[PDB]
């Protein structure tokens, strides 16, 4: 087309609000105050192509997983209305997170004001994905113990809301605060250690280990840590500047970790419901 023509630009000619990662030397979309140009660029090759498509495809995938889960036979669950509500909250959190992410990455180059609005939605979505993922997990883990289940839901929701509020602060979106962002969101996911200790103290090592909670929880903690480390450190583009502009830079790998992380988490809580089904609702 001969409408809204553009060429990628080197990192040095970018305005300030577009200078996120100076290890990405070329292939940047120039500032373009057109939503038409921004959404057309999804089919173009630039520094944001992989970021858009990993969470655009991840978003539809979780939306198909969420719809299909909603229509599963009611016989398969001990309490289908309640169980579908808890999973529904997880799917909702995953879909809002992935949707805000792919939209923000698409309209990032629009203007300073649009970029500022969508970066706050992008950050807020991570917290929503984390808050939502605790709901089915605390539900099956504290199935017979209602007082800790209720308390830990207040805590993850209160910590999540504080992360959403901190995400509104304009300093938080600056490149200097990259490590602060990794720390805030990592802390939020790692705060799951508190209800995990409570579960292990209440039920013991054999129970925590027999049910695959322990193996699955270690993997989740691993995905969080390596995912946060890649993001904070800008690995591997730090080691090959100008060689990862389009493919496999840190943000792109991190996006992959979020989708994988959300699927492994779904798999873990899905096994907990199958186990709760085998033993029934008896306490």
């Amino acid at each position: 087309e001969f409408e809204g023509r553009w060429r990628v630009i080197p990192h040095d000619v970018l305005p300030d609000w577009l200078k996120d990662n100076d290890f990405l030397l070329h292939g940047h979309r120039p500032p373009m105050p057109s939503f038409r140009a921004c959404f057309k660029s999804i089919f173009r090759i630039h520094t944001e192509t992989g970021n858009i498509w990993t969470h655009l495809l991840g978003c539809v995938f979780f939306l198909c997983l969420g719809i299909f889960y909603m229509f599963r036979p009611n016989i398969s669950f001990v309490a289908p209305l309640q169980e579908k509500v808890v999973f529904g909250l997880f799917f909702l959190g995953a879909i809002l997170c992935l949707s805000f992410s792919w939209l923000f990455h698409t309209v990032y180059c629009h203007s300073e004001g649009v970029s500022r609005l969508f970066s706050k939605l992008d950050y807020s979505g991570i917290a929503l994905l984390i808050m939502g993922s605790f709901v089915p997990w605390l539900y099956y883990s504290f199935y017979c113990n209602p007082q800790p289940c209720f308390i830990y839901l207040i805590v993850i929701c209160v910590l999540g809301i504080a992360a959403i509020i901190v995400s509104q602060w304009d300093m938080f979106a600056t490149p200097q605060y990259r490590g602060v962002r990794a720390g805030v969101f990592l802390g939020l996911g790692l705060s799951g250690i508190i209800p995990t200790l409570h579960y292990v103290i209440s039920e013991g090592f054999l129970k925590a280990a027999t049910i695959g909670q322990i193996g699955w929880l270690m993997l989740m903690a691993s995905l969080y840590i390596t995912g946060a480390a890649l993001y904070a450190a800008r690995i591997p583009e730090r080691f090959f500047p100008g060689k990862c502009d389009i493919w496999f830079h840190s943000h792109q790998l991190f996006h992959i970790f979020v989708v994988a992380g959300a699927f492994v988490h779904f798999h873990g809580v899905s096994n907990l419901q199958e186990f709760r089904f085998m033993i029934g609702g008896g306490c």
Partner: single-chain antibody
Amino acid sequence: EVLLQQSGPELVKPGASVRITCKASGYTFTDFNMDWVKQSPGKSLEWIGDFNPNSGGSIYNQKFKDKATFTVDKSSSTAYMELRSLTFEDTAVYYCARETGTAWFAYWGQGTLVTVSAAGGDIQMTQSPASLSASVGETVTITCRASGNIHNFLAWYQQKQGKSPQVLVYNAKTLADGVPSRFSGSGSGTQYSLKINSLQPEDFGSYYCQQFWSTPYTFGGGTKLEIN
């Protein structure tokens, strides 16, 4: 540090051909597209076309498809423009202007004057007002109307007499580097404005708007501003 240095003036006879040089420095030559602009004496700016030094591809305004030919010399970071079968209508100042991703022009050459003498043997941009005179300290507003939606792909330029234009505002509201805060751009769709708060003696000159949404790129007729 970015400079675009053009070849000297040319006095040629009808039917001849001229090649204008544009030597680019202070950046990686292939990284940005180069555009060519014509300005007839006492007239508005006209877009000739654009050239991509990397791909070697060019897009011409249909009006000049048979008049201009763009070439490059990647080694010497130079763009060329051949003008053929010259007539009296071709008497003008020709500029090379550099893009930065989208076709708003942050960098311009000094211009090459081509004089044709025999002595020796599409989006319309409507600018308003066409001219105005105001005192120092006052506020002025120049408007720009486009015949079609240009999706905020608009730039404002100031041109002093005998000089090349210089960008003030791009992407409808983005103040260009080094430009005073007195200048502000606004608008959306088809309607745009350039506001000059607290007029200064250096603010006299011609003002032009430019759309870079659709090819061929076009300029408004200009607003001549005089300071009392």
